[PDB]
Symmetry: C3
Amino acid sequence: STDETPASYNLAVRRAAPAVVNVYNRGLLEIRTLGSGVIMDQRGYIITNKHVINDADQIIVALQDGRVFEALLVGSDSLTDLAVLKINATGGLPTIPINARRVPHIGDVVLAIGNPGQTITQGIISATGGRQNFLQTDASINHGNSGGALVNSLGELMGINTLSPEGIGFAIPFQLATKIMDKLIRDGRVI
Amino acid sequence: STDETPASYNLAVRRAAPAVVNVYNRGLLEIRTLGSGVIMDQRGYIITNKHVINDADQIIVALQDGRVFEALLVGSDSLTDLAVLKINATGGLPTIPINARRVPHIGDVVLAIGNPGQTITQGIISATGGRQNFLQTDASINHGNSGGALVNSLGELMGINTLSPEGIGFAIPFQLATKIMDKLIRDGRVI
Amino acid sequence: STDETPASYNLAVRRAAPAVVNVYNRGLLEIRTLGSGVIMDQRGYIITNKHVINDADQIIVALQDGRVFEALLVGSDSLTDLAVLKINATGGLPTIPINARRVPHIGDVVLAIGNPGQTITQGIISATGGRQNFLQTDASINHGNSGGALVNSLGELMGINTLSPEGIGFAIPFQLATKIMDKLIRDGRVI
């Protein structure tokens, strides 16, 4: 035992977890924990759930490495319950690994990462995903990880954890989430 | 990441999932989803749960590949809550992989496959299984997969998912299910 | 399929499960199942939950191999809900594998072993752990395994399953559990 290495998905945690953040509201002084989010690129864009940021007076985002920014709402999308936020990117933002060539398959191991410290759960893709139906997994998806990332054993993004037929959780496929993000960055709320 | 392959049990899904079917009732016009089932052999026999087919006016079975047959009830077994159905086998029926030599061990990875699209969940054998006590697993077993198959990482049948001490699901060991099926094929309902 | 070997954590079950025991009460004749426990060393010391043994007239411990001892309460610790018991050690007691050099990492596969036959569930370490916060896992932790062991793929002890924010279970890190045990062996109940 002392010699061998335990079976683990910590590799995927190290690669992906730095990019998953905590999202807060700062009403006026009161601070509330809204949910989780995912940093997508170096420009400083972040995906979360529309319900997380629906009634936010001031939106704060907190990385695992200690940094704390204020975020502005780029726009949202009610059908997929997504929302894009924006923050100034100090040189060096951790971003969620994305592989556009990677095709998710049923049975793929996935970790749901969310920051209520950080909390990670394991399952598989039960079913591959408005425009299209969503990705299903038996990894626990709750408020503490709603808006966070779902990743495979390599750390590659498979989807965005979402809330709301029992024992199964839902994520929005990363292909669709990317397209919704882009369209929200250009136009605003899009229909 | 782009180079490497994600950890996955999709191999077992491809081998086993084609054999798991949807079972319906066709009362007179109304169609209801009863549950799931498993095709056992080329003769066209199918195992499901006695409770799934208990009050069926007309029984319909639907494969993943698009084919739709009517099934007749060969007989049932109340103690194990199993039921054997029969359909005409067009040349080429997908059958559930079975390995009679394979000995299931505690800790074995298992997938619960059921067709409510198809839905798959992952766990292990918590406990190895009337005549004998049943197999236990922490893979989610619900109505959407009740009557479906439980399989290992190789796709080999370990048992038949059944419903009805929390957080644990139950399947009937494939050895016992085979024997009950045979006895139901020969005699009818057996005691 | 017939050739290949199923993915399994049965290795860790064989190494660790023999050490996890059933704990009973023997009030005066009535016998009740209190919960689970873990044999730590050859001296015959056993860890369980303070709540399992809180109102015990007579404490009985039963190994998987058939042996049945009476245990005496060495002392307890309310903050961590732990308790140390003692039994006479016939030559040959199975003990829970412990690796003091092993550092638990987030994402590590873990099995929760408890004896309500024996029942085992699988998850990962969601979060690494009074003195310190506890270890989190998505492996099912219930009464049937409360007081039992949490182990990695190698069978090495990671913590003691404990009961009492949804979908997540808690174990006391094995490093802290060792220290509490020692201090309870020397002084008694410790503060």
